[PDB]
Design a protein around this ligand. Structure first.
Ligand SMILES: CCCCCCCCCCCCCCCCCC(=O)OC[C@H](COP(=O)(O)O)OC(=O)CCCCCCCCCCCCCCCCC
Ligand SMILES: CCCCCCCCCCCCCCCCCC(=O)OC[C@H](COP(=O)(O)O)OC(=O)CCCCCCCCCCCCCCCCC
Ligand SMILES: CCCCCCCCCCCCCCCCCC(=O)OC[C@H](COP(=O)(O)O)OC(=O)CCCCCCCCCCCCCCCCC
Ligand SMILES: CCCCCCCCCCCCCCCCCC(=O)OC[C@H](COP(=O)(O)O)OC(=O)CCCCCCCCCCCCCCCCC
Ligand SMILES: CCCCCCCCCCCCCCCCCC(=O)OC[C@H](COP(=O)(O)O)OC(=O)CCCCCCCCCCCCCCCCC
Ligand SMILES: CCCCCCCCCCCCCCCCCC(=O)OC[C@H](COP(=O)(O)O)OC(=O)CCCCCCCCCCCCCCCCC
Ligand SMILES: CCCCCCCCCCCCCCCCCC(=O)OC[C@H](COP(=O)(O)O)OC(=O)CCCCCCCCCCCCCCCCC
Ligand SMILES: CCCCCCCCCCCCCCCCCC(=O)OC[C@H](COP(=O)(O)O)OC(=O)CCCCCCCCCCCCCCCCC
Lengths: 489, 489
């Protein structure tokens, strides 16, 4: 790059200061340090680790929300700040040493969801490179029709259906690969392109709560709901209508706030050419990988996790030479780092006990407020916490808490409804583009010239209203179905 | 890519089989499967995990040595095989379940050395992009002169000196960045380029044992040697001459086996242009990072590990915009995956107890043989093991064993000599291009056109003799120096 800097010089011999210290970016960093120092000097929490974790959370949230530095660079900063702020605790409850904290926070960044994301890139690239996504898109785009909002609805439906069965870690990447014949011809400035990328992410967020296996929090809650009598049929009777209504409401939000209705789309007459033998190999591996992800619980005794299943497509496509080393190097690795930062942030929150202390204090003031009151107040907590903190982390703490509140209530249906309701509401917080796999994928997508489709502000002005719509769909339709579907015994 | 395959058709209606099943790669894969199945079906080790771990180690070593599939793809395969082969054990000693094994194996991939490697990439890119590596190389190349073997010696000395203080994780990357003004003009087919790339890796391997802080095994051995009276002066009196002699012998090996002596090099007159303010910022950050890596032990109470220090240059160069998102995406991520696979293989080896059992069996048969005999036999063991397994893991298992053997011996100098020699000899195994950070970096290097400088066979034909040379240099010169320097009390 360039070796020179511009300065502000005031002759008074003269004090010349670089202009990089007087920009909007510098002002955000100045303000962030000011708040973090104030939070680190004013007694917030009685527990020192939780007190410093509150400052750590704000600093990371402020950096991500304002994008003073790149989002994935803030993700790199998270492990450094976790060790520096001394927030990690042992199982005994003492502050972990910096050496122990360094290894603990670094070990948590690589996980099964990272492997699923890499398999998502592998599947998406191999499907686009051998003209399978092009043929598949020619049929979906023919079904949707010429209207841009119908194409938007189709894209949100595909990712919603995918996240129902294989979760929303890889579903957005597969959906974007399916949409590649249409997205690659449009620029990042296009309102229709912006709605499509944002719509897939928001629908994937909603798709994550619609099935008993659609998200890690859904699986955990299903373990809590089984003793009460809730099964797959009961779960689908509540979650699926709630998520479909939320997706439809978010869909209306997209095509009414984006100027994406006068765009003229190309007619996609379906491609009716027979697949080759090599293409059948890709399809078989792609379908088998998806099916194995669906039955992950039934094959966990041999594979352990979906991240181990994710390895099979990677070896079968890179090891046979279908994808080259350049293809692996061309993966979007900033997405991987940004995801690891969120996982590291969640570990710090859970290890310090910050969220547990916050939720426990809320439990004491609403323990005798009624089932609907607890669901709205605790659901608001997950909506705010889930916006900044991982949905899996928050659900692990909150769900056992609302279970003991529900048990104390004299209503035998209180505990199943609280566990069910909070499980769905654990996925509603989606206003921050740097939290959650669908949001990270969407806020990293670029067009042909490398320009970003979405900004953090665009994700905030639509994700926050979308989070509210999803919240209202759960506590109005979902709660109404729960009162009839869920029995107490 | 292409959609069609070529077939072998024998009319007999006709049985047409694709030609991909009758290639050298297919034959290698068939042989590897055959050997792995034979090992899994014939009773090797009494412990079930260690028997299957032996099969896993053989399979992975064969895949890497034959390069039937890409090395980083084998690295990706390593965690899947670790879970499938059921080799990981609990601290109790029972076989870990597939889910817990998946989580444990995935947690081990991301570590401090990965962060150090990423910081090495960041520093190398920022130094080359802002014309600091060019100026620095204009002086080193001027000192070396026109003779190619002198340039080779200069590069090996530079990487050796760097690995002495900051270890050989980032030192090879920095050395290659310093050599970019000369390496970028030469093709992968050039014998001189191959010699330079291989020599940097081999001298980094040798430099990893030359200092008390040059490698993790060196630090562990220094912890084991302090009670005996060995300090920095005693360590340097033995390790540094041995490492220098080994490096000189490997250098002679390189310039006599490679036809790299008739190549004509451009004269590098030193660049004498003053640095800019921005360049001074880069130099200051780089020097501060190197110094903090050097004093890692003195600042562990705050930073915990060199991986956390590695974050500081990454943030300071990416969040200030000196390096872009494309620069991060242009990192050689295949190197990272290969290193992660090596770490996972080491974790599988240590968890099963295979290496511990092998070393204990050797100890039970060489417990009374004399100090030199025990040193030579355990050094051969460490050479073979570290050719395939991580040097850190093998040192961790072996050093306490040789310490207990030396304690049993009536010679009061036996224990310090055994620990010291085994510490030096734990780094000699360098014949496999897929094991160790310098070897992985060298085997992943490509020229402008993307062609690889080195092959696995080229690494084997020179790496094994280099390992033998290092072993002999230790067990003769280092042993002679130990016999006088090391006192017993
Ligand atoms: C963009 C980066 C923003 C980073 C923001 C960091 C926050 C700075 C807050 C200012 C310091 C205020 C101290 C007030 C008293 C603290 C007492 C307390 O409770 O804490 C003690 C606490 C633990 O001490 P204990 O009480 O003994 O446990 O220590 C700290 O909190 C240490 C302070 C953290 C230092 C942060 C360093 C940031 C590294 C940046 C890496 C380089 C890249 C630069 C970014 C590039 C952007 C262009
Ligand atoms: C100017 C300085 C403030 C600037 C803004 C700071 C942002 C973070 C606010 C933190 C304020 C301190 C919270 C705790 C104070 C009382 C603690 C206590 O004694 O416990 C009471 C109580 C219960 O704890 P217990 O009483 O100790 O059991 O805890 C709380 O009330 C905690 C409330 C936390 C609310 C802040 C959550 C924000 C998370 C995201 C970070 C900010 C993102 C904003 C950017 C978004 C852009 C769209
Ligand atoms: C193309 C060439 C083949 C590609 C193969 C891909 C990867 C190899 C998968 C081989 C499966 C071997 C694991 C099972 C070993 C016996 C079970 C065991 O040890 O666990 C006991 C374990 C019990 O553990 P517990 O539940 O904790 O007691 O058994 C089970 O309950 C799990 C049974 C899982 C069975 C999965 C069947 C295989 C599905 C398909 C595999 C991948 C297909 C390839 C996809 C692309 C097609 C072109
Ligand atoms: C003696 C005991 C061993 C024998 C028993 C059978 C061995 C088990 C199956 C091994 C697979 C046989 C061929 C292996 C090498 C294939 C060639 C290649 O990678 O490049 C093809 C080829 C490139 O190589 P080229 O054609 O030679 O340039 O790439 C393709 O075109 C791939 C797409 C064509 C259709 C799929 C190819 C078959 C994939 C089989 C996947 C199984 C791999 C290993 C399974 C491990 C678990 C057992
Ligand atoms: C290139 C890939 C090479 C992979 C090499 C895999 C080795 C295959 C050996 C053949 C099976 C022999 C079984 C003999 C009896 C085993 C008994 C025993 O001790 O073990 C039981 C042991 C545990 O059972 P337990 O005794 O109940 O604990 O189970 C196994 O060892 C399961 C067998 C492992 C299956 C390997 C699957 C390979 C995954 C490939 C992924 C797809 C990508 C393909 C590569 C692309 C290349 C182009
Ligand atoms: C044709 C089939 C073999 C093909 C080649 C297989 C390669 C690996 C050889 C493993 C053979 C089995 C070893 C253990 C057999 C006896 C076990 C026993 O009862 O314990 C005795 C004894 C002590 O155990 P204990 O008596 O149970 O306490 O263990 C051994 O002697 C272990 C010896 C291990 C030797 C293999 C080391 C190779 C590591 C790298 C993998 C292969 C690399 C080659 C490719 C590179 C080419 C440049
Ligand atoms: C450019 C803007 C500044 C960039 C700075 C980036 C990194 C900021 C880190 C600042 C230091 C914060 C940690 C110290 C907090 C107090 C000590 C503590 O809590 O641990 C107790 C801890 C005791 O733990 P124990 O040993 O387990 O008892 O103290 C120590 O023994 C460790 C002492 C650490 C001293 C570190 C000195 C800092 C050197 C400079 C670091 C930044 C270099 C910047 C490179 C680029 C320059 C342009
Ligand atoms: C109210 C309390 C807070 C105030 C107290 C002081 C704050 C601590 C120091 C914060 C650094 C001040 C400027 C921050 C943003 C710099 C602009 C930028 O990144 O782009 C420059 C600039 C690009 O921005 P542009 O010039 O506006 O396009 O990039 C460069 O040219 C960088 C090379 C020039 C020389 C180095 C720049 C100074 C780096 C300072 C590193 C410290 C960062 C934060 C430290 C965290 C721990 C405290």
């Amino acid at each position: 790059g360039k070796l020179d800097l511009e300065y502000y010089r005031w002759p008074l011999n003269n004090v010349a200061l670089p202009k990089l210290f007087f920009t909007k970016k510098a002002y955000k960093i100045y303000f962030i340090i000011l708040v973090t120092g104030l939070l680190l000097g004013i007694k917030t929490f009685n527990d020192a680790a939780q007190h410093r974790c509150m400052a750590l959370v704000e600093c990371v949230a402020f950096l991500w929300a304002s994008e003073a530095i790149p989002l994935h660079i803030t993700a790199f900063l998270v492990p450094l700040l976790v060790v520096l702020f001394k927030v990690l605790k042992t199982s005994d409850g003492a502050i972990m040493s910096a050496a122990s904290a360094s290894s603990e926070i670094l070990a948590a960044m690589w996980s099964s969801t990272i492997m699923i994301l890499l398999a998502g890139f592998t599947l998406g690239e191999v499907l686009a490179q051998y003209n399978i996504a092009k043929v598949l898109a020619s049929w979906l785009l023919a079904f949707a029709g010429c209207k841009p909002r119908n194409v938007l609805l189709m894209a949100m439906c595909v990712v919603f259906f995918l996240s129902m069965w294989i979760s929303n870690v890889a579903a957005p990447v597969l959906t974007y690969s399916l949409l590649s014949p249409l997205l690659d011809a449009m620029d990042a400035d296009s309102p229709f392109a912006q709605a499509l990328v944002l719509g897939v992410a928001l629908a994937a967020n909603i798709g994550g709560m619609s099935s008993p296996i659609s998200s890690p929090q859904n699986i955990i809650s299903m373990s809590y709901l089984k003793p009460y009598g809730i099964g797959w049929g009961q779960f689908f009777a509540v979650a699926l209508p709630s998520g479909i209504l939320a997706m439809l409401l978010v869909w209306i939000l997209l095509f009414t706030t984006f100027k994406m209705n006068k765009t003229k789309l190309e007619k996609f007459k379906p491609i009716k050419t027979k697949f080759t033998v090599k293409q059948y190999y890709i399809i078989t591996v792609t379908v088998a990988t998806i099916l194995l992800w669906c039955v992950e619980s039934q094959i966990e005794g041999a594979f352990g996790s979906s991240g181990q299943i994710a390895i099979i497509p990677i070896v079968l496509f890179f090891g046979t030479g279908l994808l080259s080393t350049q293809d692996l190097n061309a993966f979007p690795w900033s997405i991987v780092i940004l995801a690891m930062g969120g996982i590291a942030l969640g570990k710090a929150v859970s290890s310090s006990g910050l969220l547990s202390t916050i939720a426990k204090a809320l439990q004491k003031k609403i323990e005798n407020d009624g089932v609907f009151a607890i669901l709205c107040i605790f659901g608001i907590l997950m909506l705010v916490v889930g916006t900044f903190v991982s949905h899996t982390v928050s659900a692990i703490i909150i769900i056992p808490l609302v279970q003991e509140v529900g048990d104390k209530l004299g209503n035998p249906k209180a505990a199943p409804i609280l566990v069910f309701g909070c499980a769905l509401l654990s996925s509603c917080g989606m206003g921050l583009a740097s939290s959650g796999f669908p949001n990270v994928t969407a806020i990293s997508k670029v067009d042909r010239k490398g320009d970003r489709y979405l900004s953090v502000m665009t994700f905030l002005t639509r994700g926050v209203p979308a989070s509210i719509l999803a919240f209202l769909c759960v506590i109005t339709l979902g709660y109404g179905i729960m009162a009839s579907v869920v029995k107490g015994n």
